[PDB]
Design an enzyme around this catalytic site. Structure first.
Site, PDB file in Angstrom:
ATOM      1  N   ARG A  32       0.798  -1.213   0.000  1.00 13.58           N
ATOM      2  CA  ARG A  32       0.000   0.000   0.000  1.00 13.58           C
ATOM      3  C   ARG A  32       0.832   1.264   0.000  1.00 13.58           C
ATOM      4  O   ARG A  32       0.272   2.347   0.178  1.00 13.58           O
ATOM      5  CB  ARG A  32      -0.948   0.009   1.185  1.00 13.58           C
ATOM      6  CG  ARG A  32      -2.137  -0.884   1.000  1.00 13.58           C
ATOM      7  CD  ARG A  32      -3.025  -0.757   2.191  1.00 13.58           C
ATOM      8  NE  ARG A  32      -4.293  -1.443   2.041  1.00 13.58           N
ATOM      9  CZ  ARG A  32      -4.473  -2.722   2.321  1.00 13.58           C
ATOM     10  NH1 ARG A  32      -3.464  -3.464   2.734  1.00 13.58           N
ATOM     11  NH2 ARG A  32      -5.659  -3.265   2.182  1.00 13.58           N
TER      12      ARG A  32
HETATM   13  N1  ADP Z   1      -6.705   2.530  -9.020  1.00 12.06           N
HETATM   14  C1  ADP Z   1      -5.691   1.707  -8.688  1.00 12.06           C
HETATM   15  N2  ADP Z   1      -4.644   1.521  -9.503  1.00 12.06           N
HETATM   16  C2  ADP Z   1      -3.629   0.707  -9.192  1.00 12.06           C
HETATM   17  N3  ADP Z   1      -3.575  -0.002  -8.062  1.00 12.06           N
HETATM   18  C3  ADP Z   1      -4.574   0.077  -7.162  1.00 12.06           C
HETATM   19  C4  ADP Z   1      -5.710   0.956  -7.429  1.00 12.06           C
HETATM   20  N4  ADP Z   1      -6.545   0.848  -6.392  1.00 12.06           N
HETATM   21  C5  ADP Z   1      -5.980  -0.024  -5.542  1.00 12.06           C
HETATM   22  N5  ADP Z   1      -4.819  -0.478  -5.990  1.00 12.06           N
HETATM   23  C6  ADP Z   1      -3.976  -1.437  -5.278  1.00 12.06           C
HETATM   24  O1  ADP Z   1      -4.736  -1.887  -4.165  1.00 12.06           O
HETATM   25  C7  ADP Z   1      -4.012  -1.604  -2.983  1.00 12.06           C
HETATM   26  C8  ADP Z   1      -4.915  -1.396  -1.789  1.00 12.06           C
HETATM   27  O2  ADP Z   1      -6.058  -0.654  -2.147  1.00 12.06           O
HETATM   28  P1  ADP Z   1      -6.690   0.287  -1.037  1.00 12.06           P
HETATM   29  O3  ADP Z   1      -7.079   1.536  -1.741  1.00 12.06           O
HETATM   30  O4  ADP Z   1      -5.733   0.324   0.109  1.00 12.06           O
HETATM   31  O5  ADP Z   1      -8.003  -0.552  -0.685  1.00 12.06           O
HETATM   32  P2  ADP Z   1      -8.534  -0.825   0.787  1.00 12.06           P
HETATM   33  O6  ADP Z   1      -8.780   0.519   1.411  1.00 12.06           O
HETATM   34  O7  ADP Z   1      -9.765  -1.621   0.530  1.00 12.06           O
HETATM   35  O8  ADP Z   1      -7.451  -1.641   1.416  1.00 12.06           O
HETATM   36  C9  ADP Z   1      -3.230  -0.366  -3.315  1.00 12.06           C
HETATM   37  O9  ADP Z   1      -2.087  -0.303  -2.489  1.00 12.06           O
HETATM   38  C10 ADP Z   1      -2.818  -0.667  -4.716  1.00 12.06           C
HETATM   39  O10 ADP Z   1      -1.711  -1.551  -4.642  1.00 12.06           O
END
Ligand code: ADP
Ligand code: ADP
Ligand code: MG
Ligand code: MG
Lengths: 51, 145, 72, 480, 478, 72
Positions: free
Chosen positions: C3
């Site tokens: 993340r």
């Molecule tokens: N739009 C995106 N493009 C590329 N990778 C993404 C995207 N959205 C999420 N990811 C991948 O998913 C991971 C975790 O998503 P996140 O936004 O933290 O979701 P949650 O809050 O459900 O854990 C990010 O660190 C990234 O690696």
């Protein structure tokens, strides 16, 4: 006709393997279905006594 | 019925008498074992003793386990079936062949009550329902027994 | 999942491996889909080759680490 | 502060406080416990009345950590629920549950406060306008258009992209948004709370030189907080977002991440409040809590609140009663799939399970609506076929079914998009995509005028002009 | 002038014993109820203090049958925990839980006794020497080699072969063992303990004459025993094992069949103690009760215990907490399968789910490690193909995937082996297979030089030479 | 081991010490984090910290939740 009957033999054995599969998937689902309900209520009856 | 005792509980009978009756019928069978006779005990549904002792202990508000059977379910049937033994010659060589009967649900050998008794018993005779419906009576599945 | 992403890398690794996560993820979709077709074209057959070479980069013996130089 | 209480029990985050017989605190009042720290100095720890228990004692859930508290300490009753400072003095500021400033600047002016508990607006006061706003996202603008003044969910398990999607909506919308934005961080990572603060500053929305010329209020109730604080973080943030709606009369964005943690924190304390557990270990008051909070978030005739909130779906199980209670409150559910995120299709929006009440021809027109159906009919048709192409292969399909497979390969890639916030994950620069560019592009994939391009040409492109220009580079590098 | 209790309550095997206010027994101390029957007066109801209840009252768990106990009998506090005779006087003898001889012989020499509750050896006193240990079994020596001086588990449900395989590890090893073996029977068939006691005597191990030169001590608390007894059987056998490690400084083998029944008995009396159960009705103190047994087994810088345990797996569920809490303590886990035992492949060891700490090239060698990988890469690839060949069959597989199916179908049968112990089931004689025979037998299947042979040539033969000689008769006989 | 601390609670220990072993290790790490050093901490088996905390809370007679873990 040999090609189309080799295929009819193959699709006969595939649809009967998928029948034997679907039966044991329906039995293994019902075991997991019943164990889910038994485990769900025993968490609730434990919490209903613990308070 | 000149050499047979029948210990009969029914389904209309209370759960304690169905829990009790295999121990009654085993103690009738131990009177002759320790008097040098040979004895044969049959339990029809050890499956139904397990569900009557489950009925008793859930009404007693005891914490159950798998399939809501209590923890004493193994010790229920192993108090009973360890009493079946070929005795030594220092005691007179009585025996007690126990043939318990366990009902499975769609052949679930992994179920809790068949798997407890298989771990107590010396062998098992699988009667299968594919053979019984095909007219292969007695429906004895030879390769798995 | 990481993340933090390429903020947790040096500039050299970010220039090279900045897209490697989403390229192998999209390759592993199409390798599983390439078993479903008999005769597949070259633009798939090239990417099935490059994807299986990117998997072979990533394998290591235990406690034999690669320096960041050797990793880039 | 005339009522003095004494702590009778400390079990976890829950206290029992005993009061004089005639004079007792009402439910949801704020008990301030005169605790002491590791030095012996006086330290105030605030609690909230949950229930009167009889024998002149209440049961209170603490908003701070209860370790260090003693049975017998004085508890005053302020005679009121949690008052939280609201207004323009709270812009660009970071707050606790209690309205206290976290962000290591001056004291917040508390001349205008509002209590965190109030009722939802009446049925008379609800507005009837059904409007769409543009987000810059291809799956969202085509297949689940977001309602202006509406309540939007983002559903998915951990790691599918609810946070990167909500940081992208803040990037696209909150800069050009007319009124105030409010972010309520409920039960999330303090790195991601800090990460957002920096993001506001580089975009000019915290406006750190001239504070309260800013357009955002941040409230954080992160994972390290006790569950008493996590229950009320949503309420504090919403009390702020309802002042700008009601009194200032302006349209408000209310981003909540995460609304599951409101439900989870109530579940941690429900068994210590003495309640029998409901199904799946949840409080028996799950839907009344979700309801109390969600009902407050509504657009009225005076002002508007557009809530974009993520909802965590545990173990990817949408039948869990914490997401299942949330679906009824929303105007656009954007369900995020882990099957699509394991493929690297980002944003991982499951287009067959993400829906909107705004996708009607009376609202978006029949050009958007007829292609939004034909995309969903194509992807549903391909979802039915993935079983038999796994068993029997692509060669068993008809040429009509090989064609709708091949377009649904290309639609699914073209739904993916590079984000401005996801440039450290995609490795490529992000793209804002308009709705007209989205409608024009999916009209080309469905018609068949793009059947010659490879499927990877549509992966992580913004426009359909970017998909064809990517396909020209893939034809040149094929020769190289 | 010991303090004297009265029984306040009798709930199954759990007794609450009322003591005077000045003197209370400590936790884990043994209590002797006076006891009474029709003929005589048995003081043979030994208890063990579990909980101090308050109002000058303890809660104890009985080690015998509580039938015939009255509220108000005199209870004698022994002042120490449950002591057990240890040493050379225990050699060749069958014991109770209480350290009392069952074998109808003379009384044991109780000059040297030892309590069944001791702390584990210190962190300083451990040894870190990773020696391999050969068992004579092809699944075990190749794919999950055992730790000389460490905990070993045999996992599997009912009727898959945990007891037959553990009698093979007694047969191949305990006579070749240079020290004393200890068997602990915890919740098993009393018939199975009768057979082992005869198998030891017929193999010359328990000699009838001059019984103090026997090098096996047997400890039995079986299925018929009350659940308080079956908690402490494994601690009686372990106390006797750690006498020879600490004082006689010998290598000890500790066979415990079954340690699931140690857990299941501790779950039954935990219900009677009034404790709030954990997941699946198990006791809340499960990882501490299990870890109190397993951390006393580890080898010291004086001696070394090697323990081979049978762990029963309820309902074929390795995710059950009593199998799952066992995995953290083991150096090698040998998971037996039911789907392989339903085929008749024996020992029914799942070759991919069976693991070992030892299968590392600095321990097993580089020739052994690169072929244990290639067997598992072959059986993993054939594991993945059994959804394609489940419906379509073998006919749709490619040329490479059919060759991996063909070799893995021959690996699975050469993993099976006839046992010495299983000569009364099948009649075929068992075969000891050395590791030098095992590595070269799987070199030939993976190099493909035996691809022309039938697959049934590899079934239940010791060497790969016997697979060659069986391949002739299947090709010769017409 | 020239730069490593090992905090060890084996399964013979009571559940209160297994519950506190990560907090014993993290308070050591925060000693170095706050004195301008960079620190790495590995918790080998967080799942076993929760099972030790499940044991403590079920003998304190606290009401349990999913898999009898407490709510907190
Ligand atoms: N739009 C995106 N493009 C590329 N990778 C993404 C995207 N959205 C999420 N990811 C991948 O998913 C991971 C975790 O998503 P996140 O936004 O933290 O979701 P949650 O809050 O459900 O854990 C990010 O660190 C990234 O690696
Ligand atoms: N190597 C083997 N060869 C033939 N049969 C076997 C073998 N191992 C086990 N069996 C069969 O499995 C049956 C039950 O095995 P057992 O050791 O009792 O399993 P468990 O220990 O799980 O109760 C045995 O009676 C025997 O018939
Ligand atoms: Mg998130
Ligand atoms: Mg066995």
């Amino acid at each position: 006709a040999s090609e189309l009957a080799a295929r009819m033999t193959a699709m006969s054995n595939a649809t009967d393997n998928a029948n034997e599969l679907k039966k044991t998937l329906s039995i293994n689902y019902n075991r997991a279905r019943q164990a889910k309900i038994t485990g769900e209520i025993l968490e609730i009856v434990a919490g209903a006594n613990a308070c | 019925m000149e050499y047979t005792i029948v210990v009969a509980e029914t389904a209309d009978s209370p759960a304690t008498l169905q829990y009790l009756a295999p121990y009654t019928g085993a103690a009738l069978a131990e009177y002759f074992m320790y008097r040098e006779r040979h004895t044969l005990i049959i339990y029809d549904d050890l499956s139904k003793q397990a569900q009557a002792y489950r009925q008793m202990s859930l009404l007693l508000r005891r914490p159950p386990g798998r399939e809501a059977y209590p923890g004493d379910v193994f010790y229920l049937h192993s108090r009973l079936l360890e009493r079946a033994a070929k005795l030594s010659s220092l005691l007179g060589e009585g025996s007690m062949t126990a043939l318990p009967i366990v009902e499975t649900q769609a052949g679930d050998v992994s179920a809790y009550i068949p798997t407890n008794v298989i771990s107590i018993t010396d062998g098992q005779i699988f009667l299968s329902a594919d053979l019984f419906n095909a007219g292969i009576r007695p429906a004895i599945n030879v390769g798995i027994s | 999942v990481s993340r933090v992403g390429s903020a947790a890398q040096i500039k050299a690794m970010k220039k090279v491996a900045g897209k490697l996560k989403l390229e192998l993820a999209q390759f592993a979709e199409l390798e599983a889909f390439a078993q479903f077709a008999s005769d597949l074209d070259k633009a798939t057959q090239n990417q099935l080759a490059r994807g299986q070479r990117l998997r072979e980069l990533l394998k290591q013996p235990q406690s034999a680490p690669l320096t960041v130089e050797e990793q880039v | 502060k005339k009522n003095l209480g004494r702590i009778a029990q400390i079990i976890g985050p829950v206290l029992d406080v005993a009061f004089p017989p005639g004079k007792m605190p009402n439910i949801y009042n704020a008990l301030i416990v005169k605790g002491r720290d590791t030095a012996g100095q006086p330290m105030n720890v605030t609690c909230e009345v949950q229930q009167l228990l009889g024998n002149n004692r209440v049961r209170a859930v603490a908003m701070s950590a209860t370790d260090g508290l003693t049975r017998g300490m004085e508890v005053i009753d302020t005679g009121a629920p949690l008052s939280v400072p609201v207004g323009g003095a709270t812009l660009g500021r970071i707050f606790n549950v209690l309205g206290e400033p976290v962000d290591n600047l001056g004291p917040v002016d508390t001349r205008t406060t509002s209590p965190i508990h109030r009722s939802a607006p009446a049925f008379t006061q609800l507005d009837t306008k059904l409007s769409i706003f543009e987000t810059g996202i291809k799956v969202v603008d085509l297949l689940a258009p977001y309602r202006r003044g509406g309540k939007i969910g983002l559903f998915g398990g951990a790691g599918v992209g609810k946070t990167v999607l909500i940081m992208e909506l803040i990037n696209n919308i909150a800069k050009a948004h007319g009124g105030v934005s409010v972010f309520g961080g409920v039960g999330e990572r303090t790195r991601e709370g800090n990460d957002l603060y920096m993001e506001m500053k580089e975009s000019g929305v915290i406006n750190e030189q001239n504070i309260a010329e800013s357009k955002v209020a941040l409230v954080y109730g992160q994972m390290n907080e006790p569950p008493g604080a996590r229950m009320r973080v949503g309420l504090t943030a919403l009390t702020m977002a309802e002042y700008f709606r009601d009194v200032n009369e302006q349209d408000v964005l209310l981003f909540i991440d995460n609304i599951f943690r409101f439900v989870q924190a109530g579940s941690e304390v429900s068994a210590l409040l003495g309640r029998m557990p409901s199904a799946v270990g949840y409080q028996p008051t799950l839907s009344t809590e979700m309801g109390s909070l969600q009902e407050r978030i509504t657009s009225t005739k005076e002002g508007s609140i557009t809530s974009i909130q993520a909802v965590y779906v545990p173990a990817d199980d949408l039948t869990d009663p914490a997401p299942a209670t949330t679906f009824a409150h929303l105007d656009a559910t954007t369900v995020l799939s882990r099957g699509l995120a394991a493929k690297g299709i980002y944003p991982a929006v499951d287009p067959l399970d993400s829906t909107s009440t705004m996708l009607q021809p009376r609202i978006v027109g029949e050009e958007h609506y007829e292609i939004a159906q034909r995309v969903k009919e194509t992807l549903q048709r391909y979802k039915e076929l993935q079983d038999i192409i796994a068993i029997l292969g692509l060669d068993e399909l008809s040429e009509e079914d090989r064609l709708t497979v091949a377009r649904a390969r290309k639609i699914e890639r073209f739904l993916s998009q590079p984000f401005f916030v996801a440039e450290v994950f995609t490795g490529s620069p992000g793209k804002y995509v308009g709705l007209a560019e989205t409608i024009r592009g999916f009209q080309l994939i469905l018609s068949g005028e793009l059947d010659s391009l490879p499927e990877q040409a549509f992966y992580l492109v913004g426009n359909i002009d970017e998909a064809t220009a990517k396909a020209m580079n893939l034809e040149m590098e094929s020769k190289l």
